[PDB]
Design a protein around this ligand. Structure first.
Ligand SMILES: [Mg+2]
Ligand SMILES: [Mg+2]
Ligand SMILES: [Mg+2]
Ligand SMILES: [Mg+2]
Lengths: 110, 97, 103, 55, 250
């Protein structure tokens, strides 16, 4: 009745208006003012930490793991974390995609 | 000639057995069960060695102490002779005295 | 023992040093395992140093098969038909690099 | 004994390029392929195709 | 609404607590339903693979009893008499058949009786091993915390699909509390699966946590584990076993 949603890739790439999107979601969650440093407000309050991170995950498809979730005390930490971009291609496929010399061939039994 | 000329039949092992998957469960039962039970009470085996390690002479002495009254006659004779021999060996023979 | 083993005289293959020196190594074929603790040195050798080796000498054809194996191997084939097979089982990356350079 | 082309590790284009590179010469690739083709090979291939009925 | 879980136990002055997502099994995509924090002393201790190996080897070896046994040169049938007297013929000296030098003789240094391998590590060491394994599971993105294990359908293929979609792994150890509040849905779903193992909190152990790829606890299980593992620190000498009253000890 709710069988088999398709799987999602782990590959991520940050957009170009990422700064503006983080700004907008920070205001929409906080309701506070900008004046000095919007990139320096803390997240000891787990409620707005949850809302900010869950909205970011819903928007961008990338969710902070628990090990990194421990060490996010400032919104600039999540700003740095969202400039990681990682790829979900197999090591085998990246070995192929690299600029292989014409005298090096790779076969596969998997 | 000593080697087999053929390969022995392939021995498959089910690592996700009931026993293999549940191994270790209810260990630490005293630590996180308010010490109502000791892990040594999860041990199954002979009556004279449950929660007890012991030597070989110690094992023989303990077996004759705890269960040596309902043993078979030849088995008990063997145990007595083994205890005698082990006493002599561990008390009179060897290096390091 | 010399009396219990064959012998030969010092020689070249096709008068190598007379005109142009030619690389006598023709092919290197690597059997390395996706999973398996014994193919870890070979795995990192393929990750890092196989590409640079191929770029360094282009007269050698290098194949990497990447098949399940308990013993990773390298097979060296030479212009005079000689075939040599070596075990890179549980060897460090430096060991494998020294081995392939020697080959 | 069998041909080296009939054995597992074989890529003909890579072999041709490595051959050309090893003697320190700059061959035309197509010209080298042409030099390595032989007439009897062509006759055997056309005989095989005509006996299998495949164009 | 969001579910936020704090730490009841006193976190020390430094060492701010660690965080983790709270998920659910009701929805197929119901991730990030809440947010929990975890005591640093339990979920962020030193790696301590030394202690992991110690506790794992103890779990393997303390309950083992080996029933292998041989017969010595006194328990083998016959052999009382001396064959072919000492000095006459040109044969080697022998005082008995059934000696270890003979075919069919006794074994000189074979296994003896049922042997036990019983020993106990200190309970502080074992609790440290438990904390260490939980810390490793959290640090390697192998720990998941749920509000409750509940399935709308209650069939094994649903749970397998959920694990595959959430990219947990192949072997999942689910932990609940008291073995009696385990819901019928997860009980029925897991009783058929092979690599999905449902255990109560009392049964959590280093060997099972290492054997299973992922660990899936609940919030009450997290609180229970935190309390039980923290009690080992800041505790007195025994002075008698802890199965006796000990006024503040339940
Ligand atoms: Mg006798
Ligand atoms: Mg004689
Ligand atoms: Mg005698
Ligand atoms: Mg015998």
């Amino acid at each position: 009745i709710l069988v088999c949603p398709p799987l999602r890739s782990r590959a991520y790439t940050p957009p170009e208006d990422l700064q503006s999107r983080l700004e907008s979601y920070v205001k929409e969650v906080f309701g506070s003012s900008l004046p000095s440093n919007w990139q320096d407000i803390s997240l000891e309050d787990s409620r707005l930490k949850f809302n900010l991170l869950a909205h970011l995950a819903d928007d961008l498809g990338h969710v902070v793991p628990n090990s990194r979730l421990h060490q996010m005390c400032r919104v600039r930490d999540v700003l740095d974390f969202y400039n990681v971009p990682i790829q979900d291609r197999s090591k085998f496929d990246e070995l192929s995609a690299s600029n292989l010399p014409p005298n090096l061939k790779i076969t596969w039994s998997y | 000639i000593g080697i087999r000329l053929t390969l022995p039949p392939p021995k498959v092992v089910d690592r996700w057995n009931e026993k293999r998957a549940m191994f270790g469960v209810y260990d630490n039962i005293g630590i996180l069960g308010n010490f109502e039970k000791h892990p040594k009470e999860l041990i199954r085996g002979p009556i004279w060695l449950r929660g007890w390690k012991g030597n070989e002479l110690q094992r023989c002495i303990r077996k004759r102490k705890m269960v040596g009254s309902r043993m078979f006659a030849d088995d008990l004779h063997n145990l007595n002779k083994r205890i005698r021999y082990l006493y002599k060996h561990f008390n009179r023979h060897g290096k390091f005295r | 023992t010399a009396r219990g083993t064959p012998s030969r005289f010092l020689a070249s293959v096709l008068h190598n040093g007379l005109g142009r020196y030619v690389q006598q190594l023709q092919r290197l074929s690597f059997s390395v395992s996706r999973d398996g603790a014994s193919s870890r040195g070979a795995r990192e050798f393929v990750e890092r140093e196989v590409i640079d080796f191929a770029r360094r000498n282009p007269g050698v054809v290098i194949y990497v098969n990447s098949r399940p194996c308990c013993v990773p191997r390298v097979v060296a084939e030479y212009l005079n038909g000689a075939v040599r097979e070596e075990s890179i089982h549980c060897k460090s990356v430096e060991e494998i690099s020294t081995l392939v350079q020697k080959l | 004994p069998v041909r080296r082309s009939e054995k597992p590790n074989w890529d003909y284009h890579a072999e041709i390029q490595a051959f050309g590179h090893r003697l320190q010469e700059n061959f035309s690739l197509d010209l080298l392929k042409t030099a390595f083709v032989n007439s009897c090979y062509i006759k055997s291939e056309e005989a095989k195709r005509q006996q299998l009925g495949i164009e | 609404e969001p579910v936020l879980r704090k730490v009841e136990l006193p976190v020390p002055t430094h060492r701010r607590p660690v965080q983790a997502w709270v998920e659910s099994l009701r929805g197929f995509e119901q991730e990030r339903v809440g947010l929990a924090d975890l005591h640093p002393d339990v979920f962020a201790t030193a790696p301590r693979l030394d202690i992991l190996h110690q506790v794992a080897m103890w779990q393997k070896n303390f309950k083992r009893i080996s029933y292998a046994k041989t017969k010595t040169r006194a328990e083998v049938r016959g052999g009382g008499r001396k064959p072919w007297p000492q000095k006459g013929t040109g044969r080697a000296r022998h005082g008995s058949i059934r000696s270890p030098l003979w075919r069919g003789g006794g074994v000189a240094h074979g296994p003896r009786g049922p042997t036990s391998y019983y020993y106990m590590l200190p309970m502080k060491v074992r609790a440290l091993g438990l904390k260490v394994a939980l810390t490793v599971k959290l640090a390697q993105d192998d720990l998941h915390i749920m509000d409750s294990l509940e399935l709308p359908t209650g069939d094994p293929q649903y749970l397998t699909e959920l694990a595959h979609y959430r990219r947990w792994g192949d072997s999942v150890l689910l932990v609940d509390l008291t073995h009696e509040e385990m819901p019928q849905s997860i009980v029925e779903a897991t009783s058929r699966l092979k690599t999905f193992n449902l255990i109560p909190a009392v049964g959590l152990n280093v060997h099972s946590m290492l054997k299973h790829q992922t660990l899936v606890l609940t919030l009450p299980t997290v609180a229970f584990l935190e309390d039980k593992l923290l009690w080992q620190d800041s505790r007195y000498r025994p002075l008698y076993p802890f199965s006796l009253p000990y006024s503040d000890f339940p």
